Amino acid sequence: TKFPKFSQALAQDPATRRIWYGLATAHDFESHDGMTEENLYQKIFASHFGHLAIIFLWTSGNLFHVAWQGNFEQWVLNPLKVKPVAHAIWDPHFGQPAVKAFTKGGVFYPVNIATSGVYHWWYTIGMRTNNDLYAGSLFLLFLSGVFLFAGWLHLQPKFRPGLSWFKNNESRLNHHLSGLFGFSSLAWAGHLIHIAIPEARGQHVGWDNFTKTLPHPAGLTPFFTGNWSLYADNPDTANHIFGTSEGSGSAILTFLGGFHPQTQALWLTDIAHHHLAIGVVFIFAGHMYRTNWGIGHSLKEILDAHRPPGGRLGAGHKGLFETITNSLHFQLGLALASIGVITSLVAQHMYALPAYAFIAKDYTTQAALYTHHQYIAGFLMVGAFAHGAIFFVRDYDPEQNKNNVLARMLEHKEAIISHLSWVSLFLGFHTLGLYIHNDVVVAFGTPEKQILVEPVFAQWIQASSGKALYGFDVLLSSSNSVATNASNNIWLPGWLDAINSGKNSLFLPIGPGDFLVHHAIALGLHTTALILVKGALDARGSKLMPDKKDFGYSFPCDGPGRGGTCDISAWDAFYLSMFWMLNTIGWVTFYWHWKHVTIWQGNAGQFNESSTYIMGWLRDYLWLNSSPLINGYNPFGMNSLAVWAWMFLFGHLIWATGFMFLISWRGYWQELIETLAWAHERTPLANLVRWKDKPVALSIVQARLVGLIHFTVGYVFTYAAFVIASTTGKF
């Protein structure tokens, strides 16, 4: 056969395993037949071009559908009253009741209401008409085309890059810091000053107007005179109606701090100043490394030079330059870990400090965004650790890493793993024990016997930032502090106004329930890290299979000898962490959603009192809030939430289906499929047809993967339904 053209070992398989494994190994270029390093890098380059094109097409489709089937123009008038519609529904399975139930957007056809916040995002950017969105979609289609053409072109013989080019670290770092990050954020500041702020003040400025419209009455004279403070004079009044000229100012760069009163989002002038500042900082940072001139550093020199003379790190960072440059898996792990941290940061900061107008009052949108980015964060972290393990299996050279930090990590992996295990057990034992103690006492009717620990440390941090709710008087809660006096005339007025009003999510008040759920989160993070770190460090070998690097990253097992060696691979560690990552992100999002739901209804006391025992979560969060969702459709009718109820049950179904692949293993199914093949061959009128691929059971690793995928899809879809439907049915 020639389906897995990249593997004859699969092309010669006489079973369906060939098809399955050709699917699942299509992108492991390194393992493909006759794969050279130049071909590997060039294929990755072209694939990156294709991926960028796909992203551009996806965003273009979003814009096009909001422009065509959307209510953006009638949403920019009363954004706090009109629900934003994502796209129209055309399903030939809908009944008249369903069509009517989904015509909620005042559009006269069934629609979906967007939960992505693109409406608020674009309105803040400066989009006002549907023609603006359509032009954006046209440009993004053009950009997808350009990047597809670039990907095709750079696979041509005279345009294929070389490895001396792919491994050029200094020039790529300089260009990515200076141009991709720095000048890109500078251009975003330019957009925010030339379009977004005038649009937020009711002055339309576009391609036909931006070359004659001054972003500031003084023009660029304050810039080219050193009188930069003239760009902060006359900010927008507190009575500014976003999108209109009533209450607007003339400042383009400010550091007011806090939130705009009407929009309850950060000041656009503050955002513009932020982007300009980080742009110049990144431009400076992108001039650090040596390129075709004499100025700059060399990362190899720095890494080799950094060795503490005490010798507590050994050879320090010698050889890491070659290790990282020659291992794409090391780079992949670093990038994935950093992007995961940054997307968790995006979730956290985007709720505590909303940047888009009126997004804070879109409760379902905020919850959906937070859950989305937290789940993405967890996936990225799991992937980073998985690719670290893959690097250890494939790209690690001990002789090159003779007694540097990496070899030392491997040296004391036992200490690392054992202490990680101890801290996991510590956290788990005691957090679960406190929860059970509270459960039992409250059950016996003695809630006064609960162990409720005030999160005084986090409360102290809040007070240091300027929260006066808790009486600490530390740094910014103190009016006579040097920290207060230093920033009293820049941002502290607005920042204090934001922190000390209970109308926002900035530094929400916390209590013993928050303490307990935080330590549950600590347990989850530590146990996921335990599984992943153990997998990575034992990937090359353990005492059970001391030659694991020979077998690779994702082999099924080593047989029933030596006591049994099920799940003895680093892939299995990934497979096992993914359960735990899902658990932990579930805990995180449960906490976020319940706290915010209680605050939104104003009964924060419900969380403060029921968060201390697990029955409180099971009753006052899940059972209580599932009512509208499970009533999406019922014997007495249906509403728009029927889709979310159906998807809730869908997630339950696929979750339980994954249980099948995770509990039932291969031999049973193989001995059953044998009987099935016998029956087919022996049945008249159906033995006229024969399989071209011998029907076999699924492999061990394949079954683990399929069960994990079903489990994950059920997890995600069940919670997505619950969160969106409950938020939309409660508010």
Binding site: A46, F49, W68, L141, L148, F149, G151, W152
Partner: peptide, 30 residues
């Protein structure tokens, strides 16, 4: 508000991008 001519221009750009995507897919499959 979005006219059929506009939707048609969008479709033409989509078709061009599809052609380029097929080209890139071929070049990658090699």
């Amino acid at each position: 508000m979005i006219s059929d001519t506009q939707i048609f221009v969008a479709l033409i750009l989509a078709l061009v991008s599809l052609v380029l995507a097929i080209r890139l897919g071929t070049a990658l499959y090699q």
